[PDB]
Design a binder for this molecule. Sequence first.
Ligand SMILES: Cc1cc(-c2cnc(NCc3c(F)ccc4c3CCO4)n3cc(C#N)nc23)n(C)n1
Ligand code: NA
Ligand code: NA
Length: 361
Amino acid sequence: YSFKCVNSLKEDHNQPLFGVQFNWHSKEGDPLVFATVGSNRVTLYECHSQGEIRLLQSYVDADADENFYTCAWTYDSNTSHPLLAVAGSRGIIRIINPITMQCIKHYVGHGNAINELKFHPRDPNLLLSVSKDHALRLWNIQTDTLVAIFGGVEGHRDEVLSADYDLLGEKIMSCGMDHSLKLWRINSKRMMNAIKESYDYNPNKTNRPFISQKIHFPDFSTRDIHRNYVDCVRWLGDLILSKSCENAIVCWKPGKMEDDIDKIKPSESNVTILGRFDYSQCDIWYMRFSMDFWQKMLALGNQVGKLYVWDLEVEDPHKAKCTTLTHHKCGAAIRQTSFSRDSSILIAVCDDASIWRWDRL
Ligand SMILES: Cc1cc(-c2cnc(NCc3c(F)ccc4c3CCO4)n3cc(C#N)nc23)n(C)n1
Ligand code: NA
Ligand code: NA
């Protein structure tokens, strides 16, 4: 069963769609749902049979000058109800109730735009934001606390564009405009204690403010993978996938070939390149690749509407199998893609506000 294009639509604001995410927490027996973000809007859609994309409801920011760049799903840890976090150029994180599209609460702190949001893979309350102000921030949305800020002179020296947690949420890799990729361990004694204290914090029961950690030294750093802005990074096991605007996703690891990622010291000067997935016409800034839930597949769109999909179910990264998907009516730049949890549907969103649905048939 290969992917076939079954439907498309266009949002009425005619501005770029910069983010799309399926809700991988959608419940058994419920339709698949994805969110899109662009302009000052967040919109939810349901996937139905015969390729139908059913429009539900939007959240529209009161600031006409807001531009949402990113969204991420989680759930309420006490009720299991789904939640959607969104953020963009205003640097405000909004937690949206996707049922009613009400803004439930918001967080301010970043000195500028937020370029990506990610939830911890094991803890639905821990939200990571990366910002134009050169820092990452880790929030606890259960107690509304800023747990840690990752920055300083040895942190990123320009806008941070992307970050990703590893499998267990023990470490973060970040990347951005300074061409660098940086590792931040969050399973240190200091960070585990900070997370524990954030859960114990209730401003109604104490006089102290909550103290955020300032983490000023990454556990690894390299500028030897890309030669331009690094705008997307993801873990693949202990390996890293990252891209710039140089028509390539590089698969690499810190240290030499046989170096364990958890033995890597901050002074480590070597990296190892395990493969590189080349493609065409994707040389503009701000284009994201995505993986499915099981990390069997990788997808990326290019600036003229072509989709590349790599099968990662092979013995080594450089053996990945590529397929391409095109439609004669899809010619705008694809900023982000999202697989449904089972990988039966792939959605792409574009600079002309169009949405493209591909079904595995
Ligand atoms: C034509 C155009 C493009 C953008 C734009 C998009 N996305 C971001 N950040 C989000 C992001 C990212 F960090 C890395 C990869 C990526 C995404 C969205 C799609 O893949 N942007 C940050 C600034 C600034 N300053 N501009 C943008 N605009 C406003 N207009
Ligand atoms: Na249509
Ligand atoms: Na108090």
